[PDB]
Design a protein around this ligand. Sequence first.
Ligand SMILES: O=C(O)CO/N=C(/c1ccccc1)c1ccc(Cl)c(Cl)c1
Ligand SMILES: O=C(O)CO/N=C(\c1ccccc1)c1ccc(Cl)c(Cl)c1
Lengths: 115, 116, 116, 115
Amino acid sequence: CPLMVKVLDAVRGSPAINVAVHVFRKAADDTWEPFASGKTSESGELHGLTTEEEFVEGIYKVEIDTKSYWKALGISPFHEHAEVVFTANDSGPRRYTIAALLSPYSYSTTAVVTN
Amino acid sequence: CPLMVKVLDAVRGSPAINVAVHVFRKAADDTWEPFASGKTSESGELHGLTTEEEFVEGIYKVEIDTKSYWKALGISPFHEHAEVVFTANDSGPRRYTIAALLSPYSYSTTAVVTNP
Amino acid sequence: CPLMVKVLDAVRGSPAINVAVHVFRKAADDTWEPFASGKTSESGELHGLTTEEEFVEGIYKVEIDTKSYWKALGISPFHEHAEVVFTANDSGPRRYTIAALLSPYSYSTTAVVTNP
Amino acid sequence: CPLMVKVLDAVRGSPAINVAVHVFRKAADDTWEPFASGKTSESGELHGLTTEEEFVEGIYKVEIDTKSYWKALGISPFHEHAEVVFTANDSGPRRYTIAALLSPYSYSTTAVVTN
Ligand SMILES: O=C(O)CO/N=C(/c1ccccc1)c1ccc(Cl)c(Cl)c1
Ligand SMILES: O=C(O)CO/N=C(\c1ccccc1)c1ccc(Cl)c(Cl)c1
């Protein structure tokens, strides 16, 4: 699995469950084409988005539906969503984990790239 | 000043200076229209982007060009840019500070919203 | 002002007001001695803790009483407090801003260090 | 395993490996008594610190030796260490994960409490 997403909730100190996640790849058209999508699991994780074959070098966007998550909790959030845009590179390590820590008025994101 | 951007560098412990920022507003046809742009100062701040009259309700996107920033320091970073998307002035006018704390493989963004 | 503390609330998108802050300096016997203390203002800032003369080289600890803060908002948080420990003025005097961004189960702290 | 620590490096986008971690429990003496310690693994994780029997309600301090980590990388860091102080509570969920994301002049920490 070369791309995994992990979403955490900083208010409840828990994994962010059932969060919609959409992945896009930039096309020569210069527009974002849908690539993969999922809802996070009970552990806040989303796996099996793509394969090694499919995940070629390019610019990818990971879009996390944070607003719907906070709305579900009855908490008024600042952001429409959290979007992480990055370039996938062959020179780098094989596996990418995109992590997001969510708060109603803030988020943090990090990438953990490993072999 | 209803919209201010502050960018900090978590590697150097400093303001992130001369960072390009672009602000977009969602149009009637759903396209992102250019709204305002600038560079952060020596204090990592960008002020004077808009006015109270111009800054109407809407969905706005603040794009911070972090990749150029890191590249000028010799660092090849993970992210193309940091993007902050939010609905503004939904419940009347407010003043917004969008802050970003940058590292090569990570970034944090928070909003401070105050009532005029 | 060589040492300033800024505290923000990531739930409300606001300054974190009236937060108690205690600053300690490591003594000759390795004990933490009280150095300065105060509460954040309506802007989430605490200034006037020390002077250039008083703020000598040393290891300092900035303790932010986040648990009292959250409890007054009805929230039972994870952390007792946020503690920031650092060596200051090691290479000559500097101005330090210690910033903390608070959530009930998480906190982020960054330093902005500038040369007088 | 009721207490795990996970340490990530925001500069290299990788797990923070071989980082010293010390856990303390507050004593009636009002002083920190050593409880457990370890070095993070190649995945940035430290497990098997304690048992369910041993990990009673109380105030605990997790102290991460961030300065030595950055020194090893030749990067000048701001903090002496990262310390996370919290109260363990029976009413809450059984498992605690203390995570830290490190930068030379900043860190973030979060707790993920689950059953
Ligand atoms: O709205 C604001 O005031 C700007 O936000 N500022 C800061 C900050 C502020 C001053 C000094 C250092 C960081 C900030 C932002 C983000 C984070 Cl994650 C942290 Cl620990 C601090
Ligand atoms: O595990 C991974 O590969 C990615 O995890 N990243 C985590 C994290 C990890 C475990 C538990 C809690 C947070 C994370 C992310 C962002 C932040 Cl700001 C923090 Cl303090 C932790």
